[PDB]
Symmetry: C2
Subunit: 140 residues, 2 copies
């Protein structure tokens, strides 16, 4: 079967570069698609805006930075979680502090996967584990 993309949603240019590098350097094979705000993220997930008739399919996981312009990360989260056609898509929240996580947990949106930036593979894989996502070793 074909690998599905990772959706990385991130507004900070440096956080973007760091996370992309971390994912590459841990030899994750899935291609990463980048959204820079909540608008871009939801357009991707719903195959519209710039992404109309894009290579369809849901991402393997969404890495969702919490604070975004235009449409906030929490909004993206609420829309994925509250939508019938999206709620199955696994979401890892990216935050700058552990305390931002406490706030997110208070919203009771059933998020169990968090990574505190900078993203590194130990915390990333733990989030994968927290999500119950299946993973595989490749021979390539």
């Amino acid at each position: 079967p074909e690998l599905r993309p990772i959706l990385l949603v991130e507004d900070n240019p440096r956080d973007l570069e760091l996370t992309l590098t971390a994912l590459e350097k841990c030899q994750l094979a899935n291609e990463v698609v980048v959204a820079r705000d909540g608008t871009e993220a939801l357009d991707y997930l719903n195959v519209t805006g710039s992404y109309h008739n894009r290579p369809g399919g849901d991402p393997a996981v969404v890495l969702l930075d919490l604070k975004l312009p235009k449409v906030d990360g929490l909004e993206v989260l609420q829309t994925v979680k509250g939508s019938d056609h999206l709620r199955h898509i696994p979401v890892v929240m990216l935050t700058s502090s552990r305390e931002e996580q406490d706030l997110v947990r208070s919203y009771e949106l059933g998020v169990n996967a968090f990574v505190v930036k900078p993203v590194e593979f130990n915390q990333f894989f733990k989030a994968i584990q927290d999500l119950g996502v299946f993973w595989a070793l490749l021979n390539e």
Copy 2:
């Protein structure tokens, strides 16, 4: 592409069960094939003994318990590393103590991946990382 099997080489019945359970519980998709001593391991890798004309292909990784009867783990390691047709296969050494690792490192066999038993996913994934093995998230 088809996923390749994990080869787990383990003589202790309880260590076998624990490791199998850990691999299942971290949602690793690759099937696990079990060898119980160095003889069984090398037969598998060379597609002979019980494994003649088996579904061919090299494993994605070999998880190799260090002490085995008949043919010792170190022997299996030396044979994989010193053989032209096997040396590309990634090997994680399983040990009972960190000190067993120091001995293995003294043999200068280019092993960078170790897990101390009981196997758990954090140490397992770190070994995957130490080996430079590619990995993927599945949608299943």
